[PDB]
Amino acid sequence: QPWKALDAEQALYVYKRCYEDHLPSGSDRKTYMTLWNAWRLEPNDAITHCYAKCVLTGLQIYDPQENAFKSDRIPVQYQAYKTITQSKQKEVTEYQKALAAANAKSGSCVDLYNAYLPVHNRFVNLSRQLYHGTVEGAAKIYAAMPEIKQKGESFHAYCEKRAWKGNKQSEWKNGRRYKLTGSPELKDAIDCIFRGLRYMDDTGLKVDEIVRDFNLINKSELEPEVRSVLASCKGSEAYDYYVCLVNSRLKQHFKNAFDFHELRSADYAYLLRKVYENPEKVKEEMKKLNTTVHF
């Protein structure tokens, strides 16, 4: 419309969310992590199959609505960062062409894994350059693009810096709080944060993503209330939903969920090996990073 290439933060988000949703828990976690960290699509089982589908979908190599491998997106991804990656146009074309040969069949995890596997095995190194899948390569993207949220920087802090960039002091100068001012700066910060946390995107509200954050603080029983508060919220701007949550009977639980996601948004690896403890632990962890926490 046309398709927009993914930056280093967008790619890192895809990888970490797919780890969160597909890694097993307990003793088997490390086995899969070691292989996937090495960009090995192994072992050949349904855990890996659906992990692969997750990443292909998130990187938008596979489109679930068309049930199609989107070959022409590969050169777009390449072109957007070619002066940084130095990937070769010849290889990019070959990767594109290999994807054009791929048969998605039913679109199931295994069908996508089976189709993509030889393409992956042939073009793994190139794919890691194009889709910001190396530490060194991603670092070059961040260095060239200071307007991308960095590792170690929370979305709340990144967004604060862009919302209050004039003469007016940040409302969060002594630390972020939940004071509702309705200021244009606060509304901007909250839109930026809601988009960064994937609460909202170009298609609007994701009720399930806000619910996920309550589940992550062990408040699964609040799901119907979370849904009700969002549903009854008049207004469709990020700030409107934020006000609805903050002024509801969910207030403290929302603060805890949102603060935990602040931490997680600063450290995309947080959950990959660590679970929610309590609000005090979250605050201590945030002090180590570039966040909006009170010192």
Ligand X SMILES: CCCCC[C@H](O)/C=C/[C@@H]1[C@@H](C/C=C\CCCC(=O)O)[C@H]2CO[C@@H]1C2
Q: Which two tokens stand for residue 173?
A: 């100068």
Q: How many residues bind ligand X (CB under 6 A)?
A: 18
Query: Minimum Å distance from CB 134 to ligand X?
Result: 5
Exposure class string for 111-148: b at 16+ Cβ within 10 A, else e: bbbbbbbebbeebeebbbbbbbbeeebbebbbeeeeeb
Candidate residues 15, 158, 164, 194; the one interacting with ligand X per rule CB under 6 A: 15
- Among residues 6, 23, 50, 52, which is the contact residue for ligand X, using CB under 6 A? 52
Q: Give least dist CB 172 to ligand X, A.
A: 26
133 is in an annotated binding site: yes
- Tell me which stretch binds ligand X (CB under 6 A): 14-22, 72-80, 81-89, 252-260: 14-22
39 is in an annotated binding site: yes
168's CB contacts (< 8 A; 6+ apart) are 185
Among 135, 167, 224, 234, binds ligand X (CB under 6 A): 135
Q: In the bound complex, which residue of the shown chain has the CB atom lying closest to ligand X?
A: 15
Check the annotation: does 151 bind a ligand: yes
Residue type at position 160 = E
* Binding to ligand X, residues 65-124 (CB under 6 A): 120
Binds ligand X (CB under 6 A): choice among 17, 82, 122, 151? 151
User: For residues 51 and 36, is the Cβ–Cβ distance under 8 A?
Assistant: yes
Q: Does 226 bind ligand X (CB under 6 A)?
A: no
Stretch of residues binding ligand X (CB under 6 A), selected from 49-57, 75-83, 154-162, 278-286: 49-57
Distance, in Å, from the CA atom of 26 to the CA atom of 29, rounded to the nearest integer, reads 6
Near ligand X by CB under 6 A, which window of 131-139, 186-194, 197-205, 249-257?
131-139
Residue 212 engages ligand X in binding (rule: CB under 6 A): no
Cα gap 283→280, rounded to integer Å: 5
Residue numbers in the known binding site for thromboxane A2 are: 36, 51, 151
Residue numbers in the known binding site for leukotriene C4 are: 39, 133, 151
List interacting residues with ligand X (CB under 6 A): 12, 15-16, 19, 36-37, 39, 41, 52, 55-56, 120, 132-135, 138, 151
